[PDB]
Amino acid sequence: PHELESQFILRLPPEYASTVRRAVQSGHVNLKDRLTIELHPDGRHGIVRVDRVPLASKLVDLPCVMESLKTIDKKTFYKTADICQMLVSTEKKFIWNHGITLPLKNVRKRRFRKTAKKDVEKEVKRLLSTDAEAVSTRWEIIAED
Template sequence: MSNKNAAKRRETPADAVNDLEQQFILRLPPGPAMALRHDVQTGSLTLKDKLSIEMQPDMRHARVRYGGEIFSAKLVDLPCIIDSLKTVDKKTFYKTADINKMLICTTEDDLSQEESDSPKKKDKEQKKFIYNHGITPPLKNVKKRRFRKTLKKKFMDQPEIEKEVKRLFRYDAEAIDVKWEIIRDEAEASTSGQIMEGSTSSRKIPPGLLQNEQETSMDVASYFGEVSSSEDEDKDINIMDSGEDEASRGPSTPRISYGSLDRTASESQDIPETDTGFQQYKLSELSSQLTQIRQKRHRKRLESMEANIEKEKLQDDYEDQFSQADSEKFDI
């Protein structure tokens, strides 16, 4: 029994491929189009006998017969996709398919005249079947007026390139010793490998300089410290008073000494001569910052001295007035 069932299953496979519904627009000349529309709306039972479509092997040309007339048809590609909807109550619509092709029916004379007018387009099969218009009069030449041109791909000699790459890999596998080198683009190297000095002269930086620059560049925060709160932003650094009492300094007040600057100077001497321009630029920048800090500190000192003098003067005036008041009491 099992063998018979198996034989029956083989005869009727369950994985039968069913073609999906495909739709296209059929455009007939004005007279036959009105007659066909009337037959469709009235539900004529003889429509199957009246209308027949026979496609050619290239699936681009066809012969359409309606009634006693025979038309030559051409299947063209529409500029865009059109949704096909169905309804029963004219309120709810259901999408059934995407339409992107139209079968245009013409007479024999029109088709032969069209082919004779454009003999050069026979080589370009794709452009022959691209329709530049829409399905309504306002969309005439819509593909040229509203659609952007398609970018053309520039095909390279990909097979030859792959063949050359495989050959190089094969040589590398067979070689005893392999050496490789990274070559940078000249434009990129010129932009990232040159710096302009004060004398408007450019020099090339060696490849290892970018790494040495990060290692040997002087950090300003390491010398001037970091402010721990917003209240210390108004405070200034006193470089000259390095021997003052440490108790007078706050815990967040940065300290700096000339020994650190001497140490950086000695380290800068160990750097190769190729980095001297960069180090000189950094040193000049630091020296300008030190000068600004000293000037600011000097101004603060003057302001504090003036405030102290005014305070002493007010205190002397108050003591004089107090002494005069005491003397007047004793006289009374």
Template sequence: MEPINNVQYTSEPTSDEFEAEGQFIMRVPEDRAETIHEAIRDGNVHKKLSIALKEDLRQGQVWLDGSMLYTKLVDLPSIVESYKTTDKKNFYKTADISQMLICTEKPEEIECKSSESEEEAANKQPQTYMYPHGITRPLKNVSRRRFRKKMLNNPEMPATDIAKELKWLLITDSQAMDVKYEIINESDSSDHSSV
């Protein structure tokens, strides 16, 4: 695909590891939503709506009936199930939706923090694209209120913390008025425990 406004967009994934999401929620400004509803009713969505994503597959642009919107693909804090029915009695699950495409008219409303280097940005990518709210009003700040914080993978203390703790212990030991210590042999303690 050719560059648009000096930005390279792609419709194909660049990595073999990428698996496209089958369904996602598209959130557009209220005045543009009616245009999408009419296009769905008329059956000509492919003529009025097109989506182009950047190579990172997270940011892009949406063209809706000739006008452009800026988009960002975010991960929802929980999974939403999508169902389909033919007779309004039997429902069939069609997909698990875990992403939402947020469309805005101004690019600064959805811009990511890009002051870090590429490595730092790659490490922070999951956090940057994690949407803190659910899709309904009662689920505002749901990830902060309902989900507990993730524990560190490495439970060991960093070397700097160990050095600070050791320094504090040595300082408090030198300031003590009286220091007593007792040496206990393991063989003596095992004899007492058997009695």
């Protein structure tokens, strides 16, 4: 079978980004030893090791949706993957408010129409299980108390 490739964006500190960029544009396999990525079983934490120097990483959710588009003639472009995550290196914390481009900054706060967390469904599933495992249940809409 075929599994859709999973592309994400890696953001590095600027000096480490310059060393990684120089090693990528060089093209040797020396970069392969120099740059490693360890993703922790949290799923939202990691180390990126540039030249064997550890950097602390967080995999965050991006507010917009990006799409990689490949081409052979620079006139027709074929969509290859959807990018929604970024492993910035240096829950609410794992959500990035800004977009990658310069015009998109504070997009989630200003350029996004109010949208719901769809979280609440999981919380309702937790309450329903407790109700069904009880004997009696007493609902009461309340006032200030």
